[PDB]
Amino acid sequence: NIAVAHTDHLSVVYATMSNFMLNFTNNFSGNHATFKPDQYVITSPEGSYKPIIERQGETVDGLTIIDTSIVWPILCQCTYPLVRQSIMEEIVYPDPSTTLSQSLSVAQVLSKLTLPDAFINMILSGGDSVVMRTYQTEADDDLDEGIRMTTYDQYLSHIRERLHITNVPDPIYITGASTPDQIAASVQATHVAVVLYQSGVINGPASTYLRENEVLVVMPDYYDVVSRFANANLQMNNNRYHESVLEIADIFDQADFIQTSDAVRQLRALMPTLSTSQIRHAIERIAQITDVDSTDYGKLTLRFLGTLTRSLKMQNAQIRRIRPDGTVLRYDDQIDIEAFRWSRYFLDELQLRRLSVGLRLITNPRIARRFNGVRIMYLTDDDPDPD
Amino acid sequence: DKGALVEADRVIQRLIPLSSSTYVQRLAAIGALYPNEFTENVLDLSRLSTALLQLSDTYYQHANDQLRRLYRRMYNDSRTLYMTQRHQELLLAQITADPNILLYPYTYIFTTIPTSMNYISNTGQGRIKHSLTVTGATEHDTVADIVLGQTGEDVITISMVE
Amino acid sequence: QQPTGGYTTLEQFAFTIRNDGTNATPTQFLQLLSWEATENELVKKTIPTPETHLPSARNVPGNVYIEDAITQALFGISAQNVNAHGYFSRLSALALPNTSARLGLDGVIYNSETINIPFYDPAAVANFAATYAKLGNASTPRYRADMIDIYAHVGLELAGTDAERAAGVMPVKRAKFDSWEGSLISLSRDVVNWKILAFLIDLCSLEGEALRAFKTRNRDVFRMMLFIMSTAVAANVVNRKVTKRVDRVLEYIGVNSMRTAGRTATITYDLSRHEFAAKFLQLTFTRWNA
Amino acid sequence: KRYFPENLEQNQSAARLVSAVKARASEADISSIHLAIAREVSPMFNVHE
Amino acid sequence: LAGANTIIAIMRLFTPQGFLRTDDLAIAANFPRASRNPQTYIPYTNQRGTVTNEFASRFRTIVATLANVVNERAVQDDMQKATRSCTKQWLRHLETQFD
To answer: Which intervals of the chain form a coiled coil (chain B) (predicted)?
Structure first.
């Protein structure tokens, strides 16, 4: 008797609830013995990725504690509105609205809460720099004169999270018998100008190509770094180092996820060596300033959501499918959703567009009025012409 | 290939991995290549998949350089179909009959496929007795001394007198 | 009114694009763009002759903006669901025996010539609007364009040497040229501007000696046009830093991938817009080849 | 005192770990921290155990 | 070492993150100084790049190779199975806590 209207009437409710706005993701495929959800984690070249579906342990005011023995009330002691028999009781249909704008709203509340953090981390996308050593060669060229060097362990922690992220094969291996014909083939397929290194003595045609192209050769270790380089014409030895940091921005022109706008190419140079605390502090402040008291209703989710900061680096954040047990798969064009490949910076597709203008506005001579150096000397202020 | 009336549901029997995922990518990858020789035997189903999936790994693997590419190609462009001149010509008789046969759009005729290796096979149950030939034609340079493992009796036991 | 003689061969219908400093002709611009030929390949099929039935003009008082729409949608920049309330078909009102509505020279459709406003000779518009009415019905389930396959051609036409384009085959070459801070999107906004129309009306209404002669002179102005568009649907578009410049690269030219979420270095293609460029390419293409 | 993400101290299952770290970790002695740093650079005369 | 490379790896994390500095100012004032080559160790260097911190970022990889080690290591219990997940957890927070 209960299943009569329970199944007819109770079911159609799911029929619709299955599709409420934010209420995404697939919960159950229908086959107990083999359905494992999709593991979504926020990957991040910077810090350690944070999985969406985690074991967190922050059991929302009770909730997340299945109570099994919740059938006993339903079945036996609970009255239905369609089983009600015989009385009519004309079914009710919630107005698709209280439920809708409420949802559209909290959804909206989230979009705004993240605007400051998302914007700033973004201005510094192309900021993490690695340290590469420069080797002099054909003596007559200053500091950036020949072959580029970085430690393999180092290239790893930095310049690598990225290729895997932007897909494209892994860098080629330059070694012994390699020439330009092989390297360009690869830097060209890969885009980023890197090559990894193995066996020593890298003949002439290869070194010349590397210097007159600035390819960042990733080196493992550093014993006789000048030994493994068919050092013809000499002028290149373990003593001619320019220990210069490489702005990732200056080796990753992939606009979708590394604001390399020439315009911001310089705001960063203007900034005073940051930090996690400050990058973070700006966010607190940049955010404190944008006074936007949102809805009498928008407020509850926050009091309730318990904002209380939001750790997670998010230097770069890429949502990714994380096959069970680390790895963090690439973005297999054929399985993950498309919105997902990049992510601009977690900024509306439209505001980014106005933003195209601001960097332009921020660089315009007329608004530079903060000159650098004063000159002291001693003339007589006669006919003062500001210029 | 043999020339024999084949009342089939449709010329090209293979099937288009639309959204595959690497494994299926490289599986169908092989498919088009018809890397075989008319077996005559019967292949043991169930492990039939792993058998097939394994073969491609070794085919492209011993590959052939030229055809190693011809195959790295279909490895990507896979939503396409790879018939073969002859096939193609046939499907035409079909469309001709009544221009309503709505058969598969994107495709790519081959061009007899770049030679091959009749990769003999079968997953029967005999063990293969080979009769090593004196002199072939792969003029061996030297190649290192091989190390057969240990025969773990319960597979093979060796005894004193047939 | 106003005759023709050639049409696009006239003062105000000059297609330029502006690159680096001054605005130059796209013919010259193209010559500033090279290829990377991938170890792939793409043979060209044979565009299916467009469905004859031209949509129904539909009653709608008010001149509607045609040139701006056709183009806003193709090398748009954010045109969303294009084939809803889409008027493109209202462009069939022109094709007829002795209709009144004239194709304004600003890319608007008027009904009856009006007080001080040019308009292409109703003699030739009757041949252009004759076929592109079709472009109207691109959302009609049973008429929708080819699409994905139709790109084999945009591509060898855009790239391919005089040699590849002759035997059909041609690697899928990846385009790189010298970029200049958000160049593709800008190249494009500049194009949304051209008075496309003036081109097409000439594309299909020139007899022969004249038509083939112009097809050749204008292949350059045209190609720049497919290109701004092919990039709309191209795998990944990446920027390459080199010595001092940035050599921008288009990964795979002429291989519609169906990419649909807003990129940045280019113009996205909502799925509808996507079927449309599909539709636009087929008619204009089937036509280019007399 | 600031240990674990706090919520961890509260969680049923974690407390097993909440515990190892809790016992392993001590109390910020004003004294031990400088001395701890001082020995980094100063002579060695006993072979630290 | 041929086999057992994995232990060699867990081992490599310990290898210092500083540079040898040779006492120059002290050598100048003369000052006593045992060894006839007064150079010494500085635990971690300075931060050259504007935002990366070569030093703390390094510890970050340490929490992975390490954290990763926590996944290879399996168990046989409910207590062991649980705490392992959450420590995989504490272990990470601990690292941003370090950055």
So the answer is: none
d(CA A184, CA C226): 28
CB atoms inside a 10 Å sphere around CB A290? 9
Q: Please state whether beta strands A147-151 and A173-174 pair in parallel, antiparallel, or not at all (unpaired).
A: unpaired
What is the extent of the structural domain holding A136? 127-253
Method: cryo-EM
Pull the structure tokens for residue A31. Answer: 């086959």
Query: CA B13 → CA B97, B108, B109, B110, distances in Å?
Result: 20, 15, 15, 16
The C-alpha of A366 sits at a distance from chain E's nearest C-alpha, in angstroms, of 28
Q: Where are the domains of chain C?
A: 1-290
Evaluate whether E70 touches E81 at the Cβ level (below 8 Å).
no
Buried b (16+ CB within 10 A) or exposed e, D8-37: beebebbbbbbeebeeeeeeeeeeeeeeee
Q: State whether residue A209 is helix, strand or coil.
A: helix
B149/B153 Cα distance (integer angstroms): 12
d(CA C123, CA E22): 91
Question: Helix or strand or coil: residue E81?
Answer: helix
DSSP code per residue over A43-85: E-SSS--EESS------TTS-SS--S--HHHHHHH---SSS--
CB-CB neighbors (< 8 A) of E93 in chain A: 311
| C49 DSSP 8-state letter | P
Residues of E with CB under 8 A from a CB of D: 40, 43, 79, 82-83, 85-87, 89-90, 93
Count of CB atoms situated within 10 Å of the CB of A211 = 19
Looking at beta carbons, which residues of chain A come within 8 Å of D7?
Answer: 56-58
